[PDB]
Amino acid sequence: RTTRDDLINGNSASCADVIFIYARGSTETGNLGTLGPSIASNLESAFGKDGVWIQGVGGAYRATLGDNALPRGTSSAAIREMLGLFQQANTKCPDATLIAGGYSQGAALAAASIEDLDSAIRDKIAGTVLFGYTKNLQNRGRIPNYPADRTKVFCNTGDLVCTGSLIVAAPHLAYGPDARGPAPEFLIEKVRAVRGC
Template sequence: MKLTASFLSLLFASGVVATPISVDSLRVERGLGGDELSSDGLQARQSTSLTANEFNTGGCKDVVLVFARGTAQLGNLGATPGLPLYNQIKSALGSGNVAVQGVNYDAVAHGTLPEGVDATAANNMATLITKVANNCPDAAILVSGYSQGAAMVHASIKRVTATVKARINAAVTFGDTRNEQDGGTIPGISADRTLIICNDGDEVCDGTLEITAAHLQYTPRVPEAVSFMKSKV
C-alpha cells in the first residue's frame, strides 16, 4: 500500500489514526503534496531524485554531506527530510561546492538491536565517513540522518577514530531514535557541533520507537538544520 504525505495528514487530522504507528511499519513512497518523485539523476536545482551518490561518483567538494535515510524510505536519501535537505544545503552553500552522499544501506527494521541499526550497516557508514576524511583533507564534513538514519549517525560515529571525529564539522539528526538512550548527545561529537532536531510529540525521540504525526513533519525543520550546518563550515 502506498501512502501520500497528504493522505497521511488527512488521516491524522481526521483522527482515523487513534494510536501511534510503528516507525518500522510505515512506508512513504510519494513526496509532499502527493507528487511522484522520480528516480532520475540529481539536478543542480530542486532535485526530485531520492538518490545522491555525488562523493562516490565525483569525489571531493568543499563540503561533503553524508546522509542516512529512515526506515523503508526509498533511494538513499528518502523523500523527507533528506531530499529537502539536499536542495536547501545546495542553495545555501552553492551547488558546485557541495557533494551529497546518501548512505547505501537496507533501512529495514532493526529496532530490537542494541544500537537500533545493523552493525554491518553502521560499519559501512563509518567506513564512508573515514574515506571522506582521508580523501578530502580540506573538505568540511557534515553528517546527518533521519529516524533509523539518526541511529546510524550515532553508531557510525562511535566506530570512527578520534582523528576522524575531529574532522566532522557538524552532526545533525532529525527524529532521533537514539536521543533518549544517548542523553541528548551524539557521543564523540562536541555539543557545539551537534544539533538534534526533535518535534514536540515525536515519541521516537523519547525512546519509544513509535511514531505519531510529529515524526513525519520534519521538512519544516530543514532550514534550521541548514542554518546550523552553514555556520559550521
C-alpha cells in the first residue's frame, strides 16, 4: 500500500461501514509507511474491500523526525490534517464506525487529534491502536479524553520512546508482528463489539 486515500476518494452515496484513519512514523513513505498496509490487508479480510475505507494521514503531515520534539509530539499543522480527516469521515459517512492507529510520531499525532476532537466524533472511534507511542510515559498509556478499554498500546521492552525519551533504538523498529496480528484483532473486535453500519 503505502498510499490509501479511500475516504478522500470514496463515494458518499456508497459509504463503507468501517473507516480506519492511520498515521505513519517519522520519515516513512506514502501515507501508511511500514505498519499500515499489514493492518489494512487484515481489515479488508474481515469486512471486505467495500466494507472498509483505509485512509492514511497525508497532506500537511510530513512525518519530519525533528517534530517529535514539539510540545505535543508533532506539528500543529499535522494535528489539523488528522482532525480534518475525522471531520470528513463524520460528514461524508455519519453511520460508519471509525477506528484509528498511529506509529511513533503518528501515535503522538493520533493522541493529539483525538484529544482535541469534538466529543461526538471522538465517541464514534471504537478502538485506537498505538505502536511505539512517544507520549506513552507522559500520558501514562492513555489517549486524553478517550476511554482505556478502547485504547491498545504496543510498546516494546527497550523502545526508549515508550519510556519518555526520543532516542530510536532497535525495539522501535520491531512492531511488524503486532501490526500483523494483535492490532487488527483488537480493532476487528472493537468494531464488532459495537457493530459497523
